[PDB]
Amino acid sequence: SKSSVIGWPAVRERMRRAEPAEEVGFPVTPQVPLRPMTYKAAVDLSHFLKEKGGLEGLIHSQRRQDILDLWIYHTQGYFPDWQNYTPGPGVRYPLTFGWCYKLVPVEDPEREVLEWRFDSRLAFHHVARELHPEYFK
Amino acid sequence: DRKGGSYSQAAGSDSAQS
Amino acid sequence: GNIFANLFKGLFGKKEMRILMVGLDAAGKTTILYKLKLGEIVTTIPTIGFNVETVEYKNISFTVWDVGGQDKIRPLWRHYFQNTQGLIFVVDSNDRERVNEAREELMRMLAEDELRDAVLLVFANKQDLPNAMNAAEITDKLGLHSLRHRNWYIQATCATSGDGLYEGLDWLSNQLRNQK
Amino acid sequence: GNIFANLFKGLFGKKEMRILMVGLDAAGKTTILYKLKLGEIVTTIPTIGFNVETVEYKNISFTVWDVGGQDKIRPLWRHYFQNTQGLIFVVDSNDRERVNEAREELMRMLAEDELRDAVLLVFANKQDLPNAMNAAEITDKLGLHSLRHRNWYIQATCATSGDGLYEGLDWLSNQLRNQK
Amino acid sequence: SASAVYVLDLKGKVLICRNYRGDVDMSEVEHFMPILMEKEEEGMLSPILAHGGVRFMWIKHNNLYLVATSKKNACVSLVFSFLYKVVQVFSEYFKELEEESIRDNFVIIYELLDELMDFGYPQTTDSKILQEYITQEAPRPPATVTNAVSWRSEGIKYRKNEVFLDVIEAVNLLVSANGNVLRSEIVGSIKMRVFLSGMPELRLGLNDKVLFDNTGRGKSKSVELEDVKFHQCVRLSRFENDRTISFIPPDGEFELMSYRLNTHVKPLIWIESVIEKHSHSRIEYMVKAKSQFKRRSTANNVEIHIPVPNDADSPKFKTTVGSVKWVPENSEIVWSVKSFPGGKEYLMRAHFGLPSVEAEDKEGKPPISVKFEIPYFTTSGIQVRYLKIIEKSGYQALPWVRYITQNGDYQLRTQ
Ligand SMILES: Nc1nc2c(ncn2[C@@H]2O[C@H](COP(=O)(O)OP(=O)(O)OP(=O)(O)O)[C@@H](O)[C@H]2O)c(=O)[nH]1
Ligand SMILES: Nc1nc2c(ncn2[C@@H]2O[C@H](COP(=O)(O)OP(=O)(O)OP(=O)(O)O)[C@@H](O)[C@H]2O)c(=O)[nH]1
Ligand SMILES: [Mg+2]
Ligand SMILES: [Mg+2]
Numbered sequence: 001s002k003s004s005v006i007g008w009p010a011v012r013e014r015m016r017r018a019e020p021a022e023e024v025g026f027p028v029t030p031q032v033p034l035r036p037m038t039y040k041a042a043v044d045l046s047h048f049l050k051e052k053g054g055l056e057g058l059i060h061s062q063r064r065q066d067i068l069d070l071w072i073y074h075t076q077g078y079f080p081d082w083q084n085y086t087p088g089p090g091v092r093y094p095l096t097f098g099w100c101y102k103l104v105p106v107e108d109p110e111r112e113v114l115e116w117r118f119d120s121r122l123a124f125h126h127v128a129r130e131l132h133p134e135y136f137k
Numbered sequence: 138d139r140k141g142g143s144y145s146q147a148a149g150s151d152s153a154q155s
Numbered sequence: 156g157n158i159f160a161n162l163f164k165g166l167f168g169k170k171e172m173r174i175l176m177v178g179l180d181a182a183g184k185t186t187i188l189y190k191l192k193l194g195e196i197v198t199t200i201p202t203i204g205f206n207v208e209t210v211e212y213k214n215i216s217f218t219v220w221d222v223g224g225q226d227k228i229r230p231l232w233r234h235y236f237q238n239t240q241g242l243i244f245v246v247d248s249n250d251r252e253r254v255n256e257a258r259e260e261l262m263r264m265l266a267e268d269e270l271r272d273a274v275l276l277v278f279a280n281k282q283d284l285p286n287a288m289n290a291a292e293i294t295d296k297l298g299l300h301s302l303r304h305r306n307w308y309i310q311a312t313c314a315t316s317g318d319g320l321y322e323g324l325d326w327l328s329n330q331l332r333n334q335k
Numbered sequence: 336g337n338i339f340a341n342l343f344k345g346l347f348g349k350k351e352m353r354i355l356m357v358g359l360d361a362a363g364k365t366t367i368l369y370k371l372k373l374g375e376i377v378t379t380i381p382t383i384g385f386n387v388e389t390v391e392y393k394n395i396s397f398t399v400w401d402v403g404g405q406d407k408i409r410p411l412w413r414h415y416f417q418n419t420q421g422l423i424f425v426v427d428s429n430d431r432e433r434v435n436e437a438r439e440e441l442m443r444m445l446a447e448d449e450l451r452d453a454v455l456l457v458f459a460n461k462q463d464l465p466n467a468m469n470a471a472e473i474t475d476k477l478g479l480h481s482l483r484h485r486n487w488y489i490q491a492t493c494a495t496s497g498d499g500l501y502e503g504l505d506w507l508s509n510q511l512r513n514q515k
Numbered sequence: 516s517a518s519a520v521y522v523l524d525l526k527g528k529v530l531i532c533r534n535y536r537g538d539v540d541m542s543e544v545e546h547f548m549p550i551l552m553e554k555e556e557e558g559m560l561s562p563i564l565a566h567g568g569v570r571f572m573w574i575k576h577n578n579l580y581l582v583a584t585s586k587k588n589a590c591v592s593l594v595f596s597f598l599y600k601v602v603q604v605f606s607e608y609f610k611e612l613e614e615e616s617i618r619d620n621f622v623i624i625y626e627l628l629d630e631l632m633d634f635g636y637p638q639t640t641d642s643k644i645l646q647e648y649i650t651q652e653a654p655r656p657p658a659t660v661t662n663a664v665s666w667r668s669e670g671i672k673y674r675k676n677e678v679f680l681d682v683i684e685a686v687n688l689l690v691s692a693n694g695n696v697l698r699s700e701i702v703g704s705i706k707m708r709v710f711l712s713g714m715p716e717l718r719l720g721l722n723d724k725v726l727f728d729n730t731g732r733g734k735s736k737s738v739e740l741e742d743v744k745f746h747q748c749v750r751l752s753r754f755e756n757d758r759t760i761s762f763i764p765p766d767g768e769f770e771l772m773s774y775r776l777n778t779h780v781k782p783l784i785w786i787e788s789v790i791e792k793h794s795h796s797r798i799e800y801m802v803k804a805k806s807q808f809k810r811r812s813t814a815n816n817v818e819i820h821i822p823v824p825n826d827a828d829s830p831k832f833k834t835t836v837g838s839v840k841w842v843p844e845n846s847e848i849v850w851s852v853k854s855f856p857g858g859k860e861y862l863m864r865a866h867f868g869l870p871s872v873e874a875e876d877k878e879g880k881p882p883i884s885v886k887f888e889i890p891y892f893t894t895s896g897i898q899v900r901y902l903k904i905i906e907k908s909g910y911q912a913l914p915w916v917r918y919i920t921q922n923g924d925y926q927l928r929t930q
Contacts (some may be wrong), residue, residue, distance in 0.1 A: 081151075148902065150900065
C-alpha cells in the first residue's frame with residue numbers, strides 16, 4: 001500500500017506533535033465503500049504500524065487515537081471504531097478482535113497514563129471479549 | 138452518475154464486533 | 156440585441172415625457188392647461204373630477220393631468236401620482252389666506268417617497284393683480300429653497316396674459332431632458 | 336515552477352483586496368457604499384438583507400459587503416466575516432444613545448478569533464451635524480486605542496458631503512498593501 | 516367498521532363503489548356532496564363525515580374523494596389504514612390517479628376490491644400478491660400469502676443480486692419570525708430497492724448510538740434517532756431483544772427503517788429576509804441567504820420561495836447568484852439556484868410597485884420555505900455498518916446505497 005506508507009510518516013508526525021494529555025456537516029466521498037475494519041485487516045494494520053514504528057510504546061491519548069482513526073478511515077475506509085481499548089483500570093485490550101495494538105499503563109482511570117503496546121496474542125486470544133462477554137454480544 | 142448521492146457498496150456486518 | 160430602430164426613432168424625436176397638474180382650486184389650473192394646450196383662457200367650472208390632456212412641444216408629448224385643490228380632491232392627488240413623470244404646482248399669490256394651506260399641501264405631497272424622482276415645478280399663478288407676489292417672495296414663503304434633493308424653478312405666469320409659459324416649458328424640458 | 340505570468344500580471348496591477356461593511360442601521364452604510372461605488376448619495380430602505388458591491392481604485396478591486404445593524408441582522412455579521420479580507424465600521428456620532436450599543440457590538444465582533452487578521456476600519460459617519468463627535472472623542476468613547484494587535488484608523492466622513500472617503504481609502508490601501 | 520367503501524369524483528359522481536356489509540343504503544352517497552359543500556362553506560368540513568346515524572368518512576384523493584360510509588363505531592384507524600392501502604394499491608396498479616383510469620380498468624378494479632376486503636375486514640394487502648392473483652391483462656392464490664413470509668415471495672430468480680438503497684434525509688426547520696427556530700426535526704428514511712434471486716433475509720447493521728452503547732462502542736459518532744419504525748418484513752422481536760434488524764427484504768423498493776429525531780445543529784441554510792414595502796408605493800425584498808452547511812456539499816436545485824405581495828406588480832429583482840422568477844400562480848418569488856455550494860452567500864434586492872387602491876382584506880403572512888436538496892451529505896453522521904444478506908443457496912450480493920439530503924419542513928416565519 002503506497003498510499004498507506006505515505007500517510008504513515010505524516011500521521012506519525014502529527015501524533016508526535018499532539019501532546020499526550022470549525023467546519024460543520026458530514027461530507028462523504030463518492031463511491032468510497034465504508035465498513036468496519038476486519039480482524040485480518042486489523043491484524044495487518046497492527047503489523048504495519050509495528051514495522052513502521054510510532055505505535056508501540058507511544059503514549060495513549062484521545063486526540064492521537066482520534067487522529068489515527070481518521071487517518072485509517074481516510075486511507076482504507078475502515079470505520080474508526082475497531083481501535084478501541086478494553087475497560088480499565090489497567091491494560092486496555094483491543095476492542096476489535098484481530099487487532100495487535102493495546103493500551104497498557106505506563107506509570108481515577110482517566111488520570112492513568114496509557115501507552116500503546118503490540119500484542120500478537122491479542123489477534124488470536126479474545127481477551128477483551130472474555131473480559132466483557134456482554135459487550136461482545 | 139446520479140443526483141442525490143452516488144450509490145456506494147455496503148458491507149455485511151460490523152467486522153470489528155466479532 | 157439591436158437598437159437601430161430606437162436610434163432611427165430618436166433621430167427625428169421619440170421622447171415624450173410626462174407632466175402633472177397640481178394646485179389649489181380656482182388657482183388657474185384649468186385655465187393654465189387650456190392655455191398650454193389650446194392657447195386661450197377658457198372658463199371652466201369647479202374641478203370635481205380631473206382633466207387629462209397631452210401637450211406636444213419640441214417633439215415631446217408631455218401629457219398633463221389636471222388635479223383640483225378641493226378638500227375632497229386634495230387627497231386624490233396620490234392616485235394621480237402613479238404613472239406620472241412630471242408635476243406642476245399652481246399657486247395663488249393673491250390668496251394670502253390660502254397661501255399657508257397651499258404650502259402645507261405642497262409639503263405633504265413632497266414628503267412622499269413615491270414622489271421623489273419628480274422635479275419641482277411651481278408656477279406663480281394669478282400674476283395679473285398687484286396682490287400677487289414675485290418669484291422670490293412666494294418661494295421664500297413656501298420654502299422652496301428648503302426642498303433637499305429637489306430641482307424646483309420659480310416661474311410667474313398670468314392666467315389672463317399667459318406670459319412665462321414658454322420659459323417654464325423650456326426650463327422643464329432642460330431639467331428633464333439631458334441631451335443636446 | 337515559474338512566476339513569470341504572476342510578475343507580468345502584477346506589473347500592470349493584479350492585487351484586488353477585500354472589504355466589509357459593518358455598522359448600525361441608518362448609519363450611512365448604504366449611502367456610504369453608494370458614494371464609494373457610484374459617487375452620489377442614493378436613498379436606501381432598511382437593510383433587511385445585505386448589499387454586495389465591488390469598488391476598483393488604484394488598480395485594486397476591493398469588494399464591499401454591506402451589513403445592516405438591525406437586531407435580526409447584527410448576529411448575521413458572523414456569516415459575512417467568512418471570506419472577507421477587510422472590514423469597515425460605520426459609527427453614528429449623532430446617536431449618543433446608540434453609541435454604547437455600537438461600541439458593545441464592535442467589542443463583540445473584535446473578540447472573535449476568526450476576525451483577527453482584519454485591520455480596524457472605523458468611519459466617523461454622520462459628520463454633518465454639530466452633534467457628531469470628532470475623530471478622537473469617538474475613538475476614546477469606543478476605546479479604539481485599547482484594541483491590542485489591531486491597526487485601526489479614525490476617519491470622519493459626512494454622508495451628505497462624502498469628504499474623507501479618499502483619505503480613508505488611501506489609509507486602508509497603505510495598511511493592507513505593503514508594496515511601493 | 517365502514518359499511519361500504521366507494522370512490523367518488525370532483526363533480527359528486529361516484530367513480531366506483533364496493534359494498535362490504537350492506538348495512539347502509541347506497542343512496543346515502545348523494546347526501547355526502549351537499550354535506551361537504553355546507554361544511555366547507557361553514558368551516559365544519561372534516562374527513563370523517565356523518566349522515567345521521569351513518570358516518571361517511573371521506574379522504575381527498577388526487578381526483579376524487581374516497582368516501583367510506585360506516586354504520587357502527589368501527590375502527591376509524593383501521594378504516595384509514597385500509598383506505599391508505601387501497602390508494603397505494605391503485606397507485607401501484609394504475610400509474611395515474613384520475614377519472615381516466617377509474618373508468619378504464621373497472622373489470623380488474625372490481626375483482627381487486629372484492630379480493631381486498633370482505634365483510635368490512637381487509638384480507639389482501641400485498642400489491643405484488645394482488646398483481647400475482649388479480650391482473651388487468653385466474654390461477655390459484657399464491658402460497659406466499661398463506662405462508663408466514665408474505666413480505667418476500669419465494670422462487671424469485673434474477674441474473675444479478677443488486678440492491679439499491681437510498682439514505683433520504685429530511686431537514687425540517689421551523690424558524691419563527693423572531694429569528695428563533697422552534698421545530699427542528701430531522702427524519703431519516705432507509706429505503707432499499709432490493710432486486711436479487713430468492714428471498715434473502717436482510718441483517719441490517721448501522722452506527723446507532725443505542726447499538727454502540729450496548730456493544731460498548733458508544734464513543735464514536737452514533738445516530739440516536741428518537742423514533743425508528745421497522746418495515747413490514749422487519750422482525751420486531753430481534754429489534755426488541757438486542758436491536759437485531761433481521762427481516763426478509765421485499766422484491767423491489769421498500770422502506771425498511773425510518774429514523775425520526777430532533778436536531779440540535781445549526782441550519783444548513785441561513786436566510787435573512789427584508790420587507791422594505793412602502794405604503795402602497797413600493798416593495799423592498801432584502802433577501803440574504805447564507806449556506807451554513809459544509810463547503811464540500813453542494814445543494815442541487817435550490818428553490819427558496821419568498822412570498823411576494825398578492826397585488827404586487829411590476830417587480831424588479833437585484834440579486835447576485837441564482838435566477839429569480841415571479842410566478843403569478845404562486846404569487847411569490849422563488850430564488851431558484853441550480854447548484855448551491857456550501858458556504859455560499861446570496862444577496863437579493865427586490866423592487867416592485869403597488870396598486871394605488873388599498874386591499875379590502877388582509878391576505879396573511881405565509882412562511883418562507885426553501886427547496887434545497889444536497890445529496891451525498893450525511894448531516895446526522897449515522898454510518899451503515901453492514902447488511903447481512905443470507906441466502907440458503909448461497910450467493911455474493913453487491914448492494915448499493917446513496918445518501919440524499921433534502922429540505923423538508925424548512926419554513927421560516929415571515930416578518
Ligand atoms: N381671469 C383670471 N383668472 C385667474 C387668473 N389667475 C388665476 N385665475 C383663476 O383661475 C381660475 C380658472 O378656473 P378653472 O378653469 O376651473 O381652473 P382652476 O383654477 O384650477 O379651478 P378648478 O378647476 O375649480 O380647480 C379662475 O376661477 C380664476 O380665479 C388671472 O390672471 N385672470
Ligand atoms: N442625509 C444624511 N444622512 C446621513 C448622514 N450621515 C448618516 N446618514 C444616515 O444614513 C442613512 C442612509 O440609509 P441607507 O442607505 O439605508 O444606509 P444605512 O445607514 O446603512 O441604513 P440601513 O441600510 O437601513 O442599515 C440615512 O437614513 C441617514 O440616517 C448625512 O450626513 N446626511
Ligand atoms: Mg381648473
Ligand atoms: Mg444601508
